Ligand binder design. Structure first.
Ligand SMILES: C=C1CC[C@H](O)C/C1=C/C=C1\CCC[C@]2(C)[C@@H]([C@H](C)Cc3cccc(O)c3)CC[C@@H]12
Ligand SMILES: CCCCCCCC/C=C\CCCCCCCC(=O)O
Length: 435
């Protein structure tokens, strides 16, 4: 099939446009790849796609061990086969740095080097938002470049940009949003992602019922598994609006913040508004015990797992990157009392262990993030230094400044409701063993 699909899109588009696609395609794959590298790999990839439309696909492998971008662990794969490389997954770029230049910078760069300007743009935009579906990336960059080409040669560039930008605002927002939401999905995988979104919703609207939010976590998860990856037909645009309707139908009346978000002029704005919403103050209800019962074994439903996750989230002041991090191992541990000779026995024993481990994790995590959510950043720094002073009596102002600096930096990246999963997974591990 595809052994003729690579060749089909080549002929249908032609070498140049097929090179623009490949540029976007590979920039997504190598988030850390430099412009020269990515462009070089593309130079040669198209090269063979033109000729062989395996014999020279091998030429690449070898040469890759270089002018080409490098995935983490390429040195290993170069041990040989040898195509251990096509198995190396890339980690998403969780810290975009893309900033659009002023109109003059764009037009000047464009008048001088039309090809290079568009290659620099496709490469930079695609490496920063590489998790948005290819179809969306390809579409926004062509519409964008079409705007640049058109406006920079118009009777009045300025007003042209004012108007064109307003008409691309939607597709622009959809692409960066998609990158974010789809990058969290790829980071966690479908199961953790689903729980993650359930946790965030529980934190945003603690007064709701599992029933009000579970359908929401389910829906977005389905939308992500269906639309994060599409080569030419984007469905994120077809799916999100109705998703905002489910969101509003279920939480519009349960929460003032949501009621307002549901007033936005577009589904994109409503969505963005509910995404940025921080974890609300938790009503702090009674504690909840681990779901140590045969009901968590249900292959057909995670009902019990979801209910626990939901109830934990709305009672525990702790960021979702923390909850998601400890829930995966914990729910998986319990799950080991399912396919055994006696489930009740394996639960009564495992119970006290997981409980203490979970509490230890929650306690240290609540310490790592103490005061961050309830205060403005500066007012947070102050209370933080104060807590550290109390714990480190012989600490010199300099040693304290380093600790406040280190801890506050960590908290600004891993205590918000939308902290970067991959980056915080590592940092959280490091910080737990701290103090
Ligand atoms: C970079 C690496 C990873 C590291 C290795 O050493 C060499 C290498 C080759 C990968 C290639 C080049 C040949 C065509 C392949 C196998 C791609 C597709 C199967 C074909 C393809 C190419 C352009 C647009 C498309 O829509 C489809 C996927 C990865 C491509
Ligand atoms: C460092 C994050 C975990 C925090 C400790 C929570 C206690 C969990 C108890 C036992 C571990 C069960 C092993 C499950 C394997 C999943 C892989 C993983 O640890 O992420």
């Amino acid at each position: 099939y595809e052994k003729n699909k690579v060749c089909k899109e080549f002929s249908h588009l032609g070498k140049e446009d097929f090179t623009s696609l490949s540029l976007v395609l590979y920039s997504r794959k190598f988030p850390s790849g430099t412009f020269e590298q990515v462009s070089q790999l593309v130079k040669e990839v198209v090269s063979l796609t033109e000729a062989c439309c395996d014999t020279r696909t091998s030429a690449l492998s070898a040469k890759s061990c270089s002018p080409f971008p490098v995935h983490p662990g390429t040195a290993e794969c170069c041990t040989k086969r040898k195509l251990c490389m096509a198995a190396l997954k890339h980690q998403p770029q969780e810290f975009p740095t893309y900033v659009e230049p002023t109109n003059d910078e764009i037009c000047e760069a464009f008048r001088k080097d039309p090809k290079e300007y568009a290659n620099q743009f496709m490469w930079e935009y695609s490496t920063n938002y590489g998790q948005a579906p290819l179809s969306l990336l390809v579409s926004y960059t062509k519409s964008y470049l079409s705007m640049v080409g058109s406006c920079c040669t118009s009777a009045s560039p300025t007003v042209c940009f004012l108007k064109e930008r307003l008409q691309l605002k939607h597709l622009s927002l959809l692409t960066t949003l998609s990158n974010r939401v789809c990058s969290q999905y790829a980071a966690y995988g479908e199961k953790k992602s689903r729980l993650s979104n359930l946790i965030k919703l529980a934190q945003k609207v603690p007064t709701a019922d599992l029933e009000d939010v579970l359908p929401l976590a389910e829906d977005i998860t389905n939308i992500l598994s269906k639309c994060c990856e599409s080569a030419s037909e984007d469905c994120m645009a077809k799916e999100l609006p109705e998703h905002t309707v489910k969101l509003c139908d279920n939480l519009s009346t349960k929460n003032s913040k949501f009621e307002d978000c549901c007033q936005e002029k577009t589904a994109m704005d409503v969505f963005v508004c509910t995404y940025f919403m921080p974890a609300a103050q938790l009503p702090e209800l009674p504690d909840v015990e681990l779901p140590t019962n045969k009901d968590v074994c249900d292959p057909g439903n995670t009902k019990v797992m979801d209910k626990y996750t939901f109830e934990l989230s709305r009672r525990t002041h702790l960021p979702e990157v923390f909850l998601s991090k400890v829930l995966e191992p914990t729910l998986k541990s319990l799950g080991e009392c399912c396919d055994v000779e006696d489930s009740t026995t394996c639960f009564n024993a495992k119970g006290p262990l997981l409980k203490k481990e979970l509490s230890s994790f929650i306690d240290k995590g609540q310490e790592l993030c103490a005061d961050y959510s309830e205060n403005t950043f500066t007012e947070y720094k102050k209370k933080l230094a104060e807590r550290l002073k109390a714990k480190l009596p012989d600490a010199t102002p300099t040693e304290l400044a380093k600790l406040v600096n280190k801890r506050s930096d960590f908290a600004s990246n891993c205590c918000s409701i939308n902290s970067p999963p991959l980056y915080c997974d590592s940092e959280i591990d490091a910080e737990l063993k701290n103090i």
